[PDB]
Amino acid sequence: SGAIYVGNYRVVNRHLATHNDWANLVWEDSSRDLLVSSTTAQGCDTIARCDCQTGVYYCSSRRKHYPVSFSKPSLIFVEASEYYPARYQSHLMLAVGHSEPGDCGGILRCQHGVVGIVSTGGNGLVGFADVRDLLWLDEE
Ligand SMILES: NC(=O)c1ccccc1CC(=O)N1CCC[C@H](C(N)=O)C1
Ligand SMILES: [Zn+2]
């Protein structure tokens, strides 16, 4: 589990959104595994606006932050899970690193701010849902 709190927005994995998230919905995209809801209190995270391919991510199954090199946001094939059938996920970035069912939501960050959140994994890989193209998260 895990979320990004920027301004009056909460960014979570679509597959982990609560009833309260859906009842206060701003935007969602199944093909990116993203959902954004509105909040009463202001958040303290800042979103990166860059093309960094290195950063650090939080892994809850190891209680540790790991440095990683990661691919550019792309259309990648993802195996079936209890949450989605086997399909292509868009705006996804891969890196070599530990991931487990329960690690989705962990933040990926570079020198400029929050890059994205854990969304896929397995086989010694970890996948991140990119949020750097979502410019509207910086206002309203
Ligand atoms: N990091 C993990 O969640 C993980 C790690 C090892 C093995 C498997 C996973 C889980 C995973 O890949 N999922 C299940 C949740 C929905 C995901 C999606 N965005 O389509 C696919
Ligand atoms: Zn950066």
From Swiss-Prot:
Q: Which reaction does it catalyse?
A: Selective cleavage of Tyr-|-Gly bond in the picornavirus polyprotein
What is the role of the protein in this entry? Answer: Cysteine protease that cleaves viral polyprotein and specific host proteins. It is responsible for the autocatalytic cleavage between the P1 and P2 regions, which is the first cleavage occurring in the polyprotein. Also cleaves the host translation initiation factor EIF4G1, in order to shut down the capped cellular mRNA translation. Inhibits the host nucleus-cytoplasm protein and RNA trafficking by cleaving host members of the nuclear pores. Counteracts stress granule formation probably by antagonizing its assembly or promoting its dissassembly.
Q: Where does Zn(2+) 1 bind?
A: 50, 52, 110, 112
Q: Which residues of the full protein are shown?
A: 869 to 1008 of 2193
Q: How does it assemble?
A: Homodimer.
Active-site annotation: 15, 33, 104
What's the protein called, per UniProt?
Protease 2A
State the organism named in the record.
Coxsackievirus A16 (strain G-10)
